[PDB]
């Protein structure tokens, strides 16, 4: 059903009289490679607990990606903080031309041919968030049609 991908895991530290106190951050992608993708970022005392928490959170955050012959209905450029993502539609045979973060998402989203580009802050966390916002914003001829029918 849903395939999970781990974007990254960081160790993060905090301070107390005595020393440092770690936590673990986990960014996890989940999708059915059939138009549904979810992002999840969970943290916990230990990695596993974190990951699991991430996965659990991903499923809580789903996006309905309007796949088309394997690509996206058009181009969007989304800015999440200092990270900017650029998604450009492509023909078949192209493949998923993207950095690891946007890829993992696009792939589990069902996207198969797409032109991508990371601009601004390359921060994986905000890039991944930038992506979901991009996809989430994709519209369709029918969608526009609906909106401008009035």
By the criterion CB under 5 A, which residues form the site for Mg ion? 99-101
Number of Cβ within 10 Å of residue 41's Cβ equals 19
Residue 149 interacts, among RNA, Mg ion, none and using kind-specific CB cut-offs from 5 to 8 Å, with none
Q: Nearer to RNA by C-beta: 37 or 130?
A: 130
Strand order in the sheet with 76-80: 76-80, 83-89, 114-120, 96-97
- Least distance in angstroms from the C-beta of 6 to RNA: 14
The interface partner of residue 60, options being Mg ion, RNA, none and the CB cut-off 5 to 8 Å by kind, is none
| DSSP at 41 | E
Identity of the residue, 30 or 72, whose beta carbon is nearer to RNA in the bound complex: 72
Q: Alpha helix locations (H) across 45-123? A: 47-58, 100-109
Q: Using CB under 7 A, which residues numbered 22 to 81 contact RNA?
A: 81
Q: Which does 42 bind (CB under 5 to 8 A by kind): Mg ion, RNA, none?
A: none
**Could you give the C-alpha distances from 84 to 33, 48, 106, 129, 133, in angstroms and in order?**
24, 30, 16, 10, 11
Of 77-136, binders to RNA (CB under 7 A) are 81-83, 86, 88, 90-94, 97-102, 115-126
* Inter-residue contact 113 to 96 (CB < 8 Å): yes
d(CA 139, CA 39): 20
Size of the site for RNA (CB under 7 A): 34
Q: Which residue number, 68 or 94, has a Cβ lying nearer to RNA?
A: 94
Residues near RNA (CB under 7 A) are: 10, 12-15, 20, 81-83, 86, 88, 90-94, 97-102, 115-126
């Amino acid at each position: 059903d849903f395939e999970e991908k781990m974007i990254l895991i960081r160790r993060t530290a905090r301070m107390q009289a005595g020393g440092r106190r770690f936590r673990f951050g986990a960014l996890v992608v989940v999708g059915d490679r059939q138009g549904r993708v979810g992002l999840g970022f969970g943290k916990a005392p230990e990695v596993p607990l974190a990951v699991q928490k991430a996965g659990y959170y991903a499923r809580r955050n789903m996006v309905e990606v309007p796949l088309q012959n394997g690509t996206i209905p058009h181009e969007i450029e989304v800015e999440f903080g200092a990270s900017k993502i650029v998604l450009k539609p492509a023909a078949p045979g192209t493949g998923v031309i993207a950095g690891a973060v946007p890829r993992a998402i696009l792939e589990l989203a069902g996207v198969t041919d797409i032109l991508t580009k990371e601009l601004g802050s390359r921060n994986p966390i905000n890039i991944a968030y930038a992506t979901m916002e991009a996809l989430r914003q994709l519209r369709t001829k029918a969608d526009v049609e609906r909106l401008r029918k009035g």
